[PDB]
Design a protein around this ligand. Structure first.
Ligand SMILES: Nc1ncnc2c1ncn2[C@@H]1O[C@H](COP(=O)(O)OP(=O)(O)O)[C@@H](O)[C@H]1O
Ligand SMILES: Nc1ncnc2c1ncn2[C@@H]1O[C@H](COP(=O)(O)OP(=O)(O)O)[C@@H](O)[C@H]1O
Ligand SMILES: Nc1ncnc2c1ncn2[C@@H]1O[C@H](COP(=O)(O)OP(=O)(O)O)[C@@H](O)[C@H]1O
Lengths: 434, 443, 99, 99, 434, 124, 61, 66
């Protein structure tokens, strides 16, 4: 009954992309049917992403509308595995009033390159039983408790000055680092804070820590390249990182970043992980961006590019020209085009059978003929809405399974875009700005 | 290791001793005229006799003018700076185009200044207030000097300092064993932190423990720092010191590119002239590169006239892959190559031509050996037929999936069936463009 | 309470992962000198704490510069595990104020 | 020498309770104490360091409005002085050149 | 009383339990098909399963599409957040177009938290604080209903010291929020000083401690705004916070993912529950082609709330294209995903029924002959005209001294006010003089 | 206006300064006056020390500093501060000043708090 | 037109209880001794001036 | 940027007073403009009326085309 922040969606019914050792796409794998060459090339370029031996490569997918470009894209992204940098942005997201488009695309190429580092640390985190100090150099100790053990710490004068400066009291769960010397107050205990009749404006309850009080361990931290830019540009990089206020970044700081990261790679301390940058509906884009993508591809380092174009020939905004995929011919050869094929009426029944398991609403074999007839004669997404909208009418009928009369009823309730255009032609004179 | 870059196989021009361009050198084949012309251009850069020179590179897409321009910097080395800039970066919301081009002109040129440093560092063994005996009726006690001990792994040294510095040593926290930074020239005293030797006495301490410096107590070393005129213009543009409240608040504000007045440029030119007259600072010119020059605004095209006529303008190279086109900013104005005739008359045009199928096969072999891929004879012939049919770039892109799929199939070398399956799955730009015509009604 | 910066959430999310390799935010803050609780106290406290943190960040830039300009080369065992403050390049520039 | 003609005082809010008069007197007079001294001397420890630095032989530089001084004065009031009185009559300038 | 609103008469869709649309219910008459479909959408929202679904209302002007949308808003209840949006408000100077839309998407969804408000208020008799610091502060409270004592922490005691709380002051304290407010000094202490600056109020009646149950709903947009940039609203008394002026800034995706992760922990613990809202959009045809391109990925997102689109115009040139035209002013790509609902003009009888419903809503008595004549005028020009003629007829009635509307009065008003068609025809003769 | 012979702040319990005591010495006579903590904040803002000539107005509240008196120039052979002669006339003088201002200048003065005795007015 | 003092410092003396000190200068033509004020001592100590340095001081500025 | 005009007028009057005092002298200067044909007509309309000022220096423009 509990509902998470994630809910069912158009592309949310598929998890992972099934493949084999020979890269032979299955007929039905993880809820995906069709596009043999598309899935196979997606596995080739996916293994290429896993290798990451080269950089500055761009792959454009081509096909009719409704061929599942975003479906195979999300399938490749999920099959790539987690902890892999992935940035998918719309063509209109790069437009900003505060930031220039060159900075938008630039940060888009920078953020998708991750760096995995290894750092060993020691931390002491526990619940304070007691605090005692004596000032004559003041000497004091504090009693800490954990589920496994309880122990005391004898701290120096300035170490006392930190806790007294922070007004630390007994009964609080804190974390102490010996190497750095900083103190981090997590909160207070439930039973200890229960004694107070009221609580202050800023307070929180944290359970008693379990395990070792002082843990010395090595942790692998995964960092992204976009974070370092703001931190090295401004004194506070996290405030503008979460605020998004930073804009118009100088290229010299970026060059110093690439030089220092190259020095880290020479030291072998941290290893860089390649990443994926996906752009959808690229048919409408600025010719300045199309000119920037040349050096973006010719750069020494750059994430793999995956772009989708839904229109065969469209005039680029800002100029008058006729070019394939709404993109210039100079950048047209830099792309690796993967064509797709529309779905067959036989496969429509299969993918609809897969969509039935998403809603867990059973459908009779006679309903797949009508629903497939609608998904064929008209757009498939309309029928994908016809089954979900039909299940509600079925529950209104209090039946255990949907019927053809449900698809006829919802088909009478909702009309296709062509039909709405037909009525819009009859009433068009009454409508404004016909 | 380093990720393979598309141009990473170009290590330079590969010129001969007599000036002629060898056929195959530094992974570059053909284009003898362009390689020799650039061979004279690099002689102009090394000569530094002229300034404001603008070279133009024209030709069909995929002729390698970018590989030659990037080969110029590799042939020159890391001594002279090189600043590639695309024309797309000229358009910006915060900073104006003229300020972008000017800041690029300041980015190209750079300086190098040699400086000597003397630093005392180490653990403090003792601190004594040395008292000379000079009793006087006016003032009772006298202190001649303060002795500061320093201990290092290589040796220990004591220093006799004036008592005036003891006022700062008493002004800031100084404890026995504190590693401190003291410069003889500047005279300032900073506290680095506590030594690592005393960290074992306390289980918890607020002070961080820095290790004792390894080396001599007195360290005098000469280092040459390279700073570009653009860096000088930014440091002169905004104050680095945060002692002022306006510098602290302005440091808290978000940094934005600001238009720099010509007065600061003139002052920088004057002080640079002074240091050059002294001979302490070494000045080297930069090489500015510009790609997609046809994307510039007509205002930038006219601004490049006054920008190039100046004597401080570094050498600029241009790359144009477009033919006769309409000039951006004007609807009815058409000019060859996409550049107005005024700047087009000033720039030196260099023509580039497309490669022959044989040169296509040779470049494909060079890229194959660069990426570490083996190609069979017949498959190389068919691949050359594919490249000749469409383009060299596509035939270069066909190498990776045939290598990966070949490794998956277990064959260490590429075969005609591999490039045939790859050529069957993937579609070239022209073939896809022709397919879009039949279904264009459905799109 | 629902703010993304909770010192307990930064300790649990930073030091606790469901796998060996996982991307957790604020992992860069461990490379920064800023403490996880110091970041939440700076965010929720106000601008004054940021002003004090910058006033201390200047002296931290001085000391970081005096430590950075010498003490090289580092051993390989020290190369296996990075040290705090490594992320800040602000003083590494030749024209930086301490230099 | 040029100065604005008129100067205005920032507006204030008037309320019917006492607590808003408390917040009004605190807002108008000192604001926050550490923020007021932190703006005047630039830091609170620079304010205590200024009080203790008054007796010191070598004082440090200030952090604020104490460090920044105007060419003439923070107030725009000006007295012509004896410099502008000589140009009023040509006989005074001729006698000064003759003297 | 409450000001009369144009849509205030609509109480909902007016549907029965079987889902069929009644002829007259919830102040709505006619449009049974659109009301039924909107009801199926209402049950779809009450299902709390699907997400990212979009509806489209296609109809001529004056058909009540907005009345159907607000009818859905009244049918869902006050629990689900409902965000209206105008197509002209997307354009903003500080914040970019796409970040406005994403801001609205985050504004639709909301959370629900149940908490028990404990009110401790009354006169403070004593303040007794008890290596020293402060362990706890003893505070008494006295009201006419009784006296109670509480022990508080140095944090809330610091809030009291900031509030200058002294013995004899009536204060208000909430246990959950932890805030401290000072009402004023007790009335018994007002007689000692002839002139005192502190205000005096009588002893508040009621218990010192009041237990209530409050359920607060908070949208995700406010959380993402407070956490996006540093708040700086901790202390207004600071002079530094008044220097910088606030402005809108675009939000990074990293912070959005962080919020999406931290919500899951609380909704898993059960402290809060999710209530996905409805995003209503007016004048969708006026949105830019870039805004539509962003709507593609936005609707394709799995966390996207349900969105409803209202377009009152027919075939028009797409915004930003300047050349290509598309039905309903929307491109075929976005127009294919949404579900179109057809709407038709009302008959004369339904016009009379609408005029009667608005008449009884405004509370004005009209004669049958005036209702028939007003219906005839509505059939001659428009429904909006005859609807707007209701008030001036009652005005002239009150001027003449009659408490009812008459056909002579409404006929006199009809000559005083001009319909858009009559005025447009008059402008043709004098157009040369204009 | 005139020479400042003595300036001391008063101390009151909350260590706050409730009032200010400043004497004024002129060739006509000497009169001690009391000033507000805001005027004292403007004096400490102007770095006013004993033995200097200052200019004080009431309605505006602003404080100016003319300079150090010429009588003390002989004690130091070298000094950075310039010396001005001691002014003449009564300390308190009421005068009429006819100034011509534009409604746009008034509109900018009321629009933004550029001038004033506030620390926020100094930051602005 | 400004009158400046240029010479080699003999000695520098400062007394801190206002701080009052003297400055003794030497030139080949004449050797001079001057007295320093509060602002002058603050300026010299701010400039880190010690005996044995040739300095230039402006009286009016 | 966007300095108020009243401050500029007061600066002009004060500089004129300085010239009357003789402490400061005013010298003419040259303004060179190349390829002015691309300048917007608004700057031309403002230049024609703005050139009538007494402090407006003599200027020199160049035109490549016609
Ligand atoms: N091969 C497939 N198997 C299962 N579902 C698919 C497939 N291809 C497309 N879909 C579904 O069709 C829906 C619409 O796809 P769409 O985004 O219109 O594709 P395109 O971007 O190519 O037009 C998606 O939600 C996706 O789940
Ligand atoms: N003569 C050559 N030898 C080897 N590789 C070449 C040559 N010319 C071009 N290339 C390759 O072609 C790729 C694209 O070149 P490109 O920048 O498009 O040339 P142009 O700028 O002349 O169009 C480069 O990565 C380069 O490695
Ligand atoms: N079914 C209905 N029953 C009663 N009144 C209606 C109905 N539909 C529309 N109306 C009238 O239409 C008016 C609102 O129209 P509106 O929704 O603004 O039109 P549009 O959607 O074209 O802007 C309301 O005042 C209401 O009285």
């Amino acid at each position: 009954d509990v509902t998470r922040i994630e809910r069912i969606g158009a592309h949310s019914h598929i998890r992972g992309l099934g493949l084999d050792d020979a890269l032979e796409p299955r007929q039905a794998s993880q809820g995906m049917v069709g596009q043999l060459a598309a899935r196979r090339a997606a596995g080739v370029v996916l293994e290429m992403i896993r290798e990451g031996k080269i950089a500055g490569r761009a792959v454009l997918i081509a096909g009719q509308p409704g061929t599942g470009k975003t479906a195979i894209a999300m399938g490749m992204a999920q099959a790539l595995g987690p902890d892999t940098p992935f940035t998918a942005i719309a063509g209109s997201e790069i437009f900003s009033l505060e930031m220039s488009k060159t900075e938008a695309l630039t940060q888009a190429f920078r953020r998708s390159i991750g760096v995995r580092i290894k750092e060993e640390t020691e931390i002491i985190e526990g619940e304070v039983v007691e605090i005692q100090i004596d000032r004559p150099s003041k000497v004091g100790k504090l009693t800490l408790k954990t589920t496994e053990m309880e122990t005391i710490y004898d701290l120096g004068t300035k170490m006392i000055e930190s806790l007294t400066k922070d007004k630390v009291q007994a009964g609080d769960v804190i974390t102490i680092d010996k190497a750095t010397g900083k103190i981090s107050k997590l909160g207070r205990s439930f039973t200890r804070a229960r004694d107070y009749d009221a609580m202050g404006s800023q307070t929180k309850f944290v359970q008693c820590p379990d395990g070792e009080l002082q843990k010395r361990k090595e942790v692998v931290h995964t960092v992204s390249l976009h974070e370092i830019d703001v931190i090295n540009s401004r004194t506070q990089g996290f405030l503008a990182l979460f605020s998004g206020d930073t804009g118009e970044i100088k290229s010299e700081v970026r060059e110093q970043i690439n030089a220092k990261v190259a020095e880290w790679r020479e030291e072998g301390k941290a290893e860089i992980i390649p990443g994926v940058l996906f752009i959808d509906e690229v048919h409408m884009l600025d010719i300045e961006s199309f000119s920037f993508l040349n050096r973006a591809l010719e750069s020494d380092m750059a994430p793999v590019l995956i772009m989708a174009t839904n229109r065969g020939i469209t005039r680029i905004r800002g100029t008058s020209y006729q070019s394939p995929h709404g993109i210039p011919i100079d950048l047209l050869d830099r792309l690796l085009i993967v064509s797709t094929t529309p779905y067959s009426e036989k496969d429509t029944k299969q993918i609809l059978r897969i969509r039935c398991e998403e809603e867990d609403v059973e459908m009779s074999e006679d309903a797949y003929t009508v629903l497939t007839r609608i998904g064929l004669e008209t757009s498939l997404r309309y029928a994908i809405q016809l089954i979900t909208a039909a299940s509600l009418v079925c529950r209104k009928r209090k039946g255990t399974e949907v019927q053809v009369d449900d698809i006829k009823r919802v088909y009478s309730l909702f009309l296709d875009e062509s039909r709405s255009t037909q009525y819009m032609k009859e009433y068009q004179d009454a409508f404004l700005f016909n | 290791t380093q990720r393979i870059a598309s141009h990473s196989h170009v290590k330079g021009l590969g010129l001969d001793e007599s000036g002629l361009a060898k056929q195959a050198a530094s992974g570059l084949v053909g284009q003898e005229n362009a390689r020799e012309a650039c061979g004279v251009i690099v002689e102009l850069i090394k000569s530094k006799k002229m300034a404001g020179r603008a070279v133009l590179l024209a030709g069909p897409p995929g002729t390698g003018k970018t590989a030659l321009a990037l080969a110029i910097a590799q042939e020159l080395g890391s001594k002279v700076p090189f600043c590639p800039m695309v024309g797309s970066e000229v358009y910006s919301t915060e900073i104006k185009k003229t300020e972008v081009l000017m800041e690029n002109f300041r980015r190209a040129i750079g300086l190098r200044i040699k400086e000597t440093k003397e630093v005392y560092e180490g653990e403090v063994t003792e601190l004594t207030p040395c008292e000379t005996e000079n009793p006087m009726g006016g003032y009772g006690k006298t202190i001649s000097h303060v002795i500061i001990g320093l201990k290092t792994a290589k040796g220990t040294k004591q220093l006799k300092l004036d008592p005036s510095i003891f006022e700062s040593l008493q002004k800031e926290r100084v404890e026995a064993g504190d590693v401190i930074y003291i410069e003889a020239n500047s005279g300032a005293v900073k506290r680095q932190g506590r030594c690592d030797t005393y960290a074992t006495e306390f289980d918890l301490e607020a002070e961080e423990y820095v290790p004792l410096p390894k080396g001599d107590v007195h360290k005098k070393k000469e280092i040459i720092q390279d700073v570009t005129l653009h860096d000088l213009d930014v440091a002169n543009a905004r104050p680095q010191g945060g002692q002022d409240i306006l510098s602290m608040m302005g440091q808290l504000m978000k940094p934005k590119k600001t238009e720099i007045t010509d007065k600061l440029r003139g002052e920088i030119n004057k002080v640079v002239n002074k240091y050059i007259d002294q001979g302490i600072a070494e000045l080297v010119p930069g090489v500015l590169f510009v790609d997609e020059v046809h994307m510039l605004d007509i205002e930038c095209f006219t601004y490049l006239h006054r920008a190039l006529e100046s004597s401080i303008a570094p050498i600029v190279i241009f790359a144009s892959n477009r033919g006769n086109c309409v000039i951006r900013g004007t609807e009815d104005i058409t000019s060859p190559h996409g550049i107005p005739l005024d700047l087009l008359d000033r720039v030196m045009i260099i023509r580039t031509m497309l490669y022959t199928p044989q040169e296509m096969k040779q470049i494909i072999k060079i890229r194959a050996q660069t990426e570490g891929i083996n190609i069979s004879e017949e498959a190389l012939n068919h691949l050359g037929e594919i490249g000749t049919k469409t383009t060299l770039r596509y035939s270069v892109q066909l190498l990776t999936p045939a290598n990966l799929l070949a490794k998956i199939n277990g064959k260490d070398s590429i075969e005609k069936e591999h490039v045939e399956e790859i050529s069957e799955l993937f579609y070239d730009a022209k073939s896809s463009a022709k397919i879009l015509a039949d279904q264009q009604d459905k799109y | 309470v629902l703010s993304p910066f909770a010192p307990d959430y930064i300790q649990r999310s930073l030091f606790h992962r469901k796998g060996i390799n996982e991307e957790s935010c604020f992992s860069f803050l461990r490379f920064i000198d800023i403490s996880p609780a110091e970041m939440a106290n700076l965010m929720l406290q106000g601008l004054l704490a940021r002003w004090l943190a910058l006033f201390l960040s200047l002296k931290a830039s001085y000391r970081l510069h005096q430590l950075r300009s010498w003490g090289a080369p580092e051993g390989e065992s020290h190369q296996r595990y990075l040290r705090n403050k490594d992320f800040l390049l602000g003083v590494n520039f030749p024209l930086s104020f301490p230099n | 020498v040029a100065s604005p003609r008129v100067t205005a005082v920032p507006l204030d809010s008037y309320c019917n309770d006492r607590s808003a008069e408390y917040e009004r007197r605190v807002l108008k007079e000192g604001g926050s104490l550490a923020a007021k001294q932190c703006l005047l001397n630039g830091a609170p420890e620079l304010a205590a360091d200024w009080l203790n630095r008054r007796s010191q032989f070598f004082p440090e530089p200030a952090g604020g409005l104490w460090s920044i001084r105007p060419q003439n004065g923070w107030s725009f009031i000006r007295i012509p002085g004896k410099e502008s009185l000589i140009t009023d009559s040509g006989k005074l300038y001729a006698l000064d050149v003759l003297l």
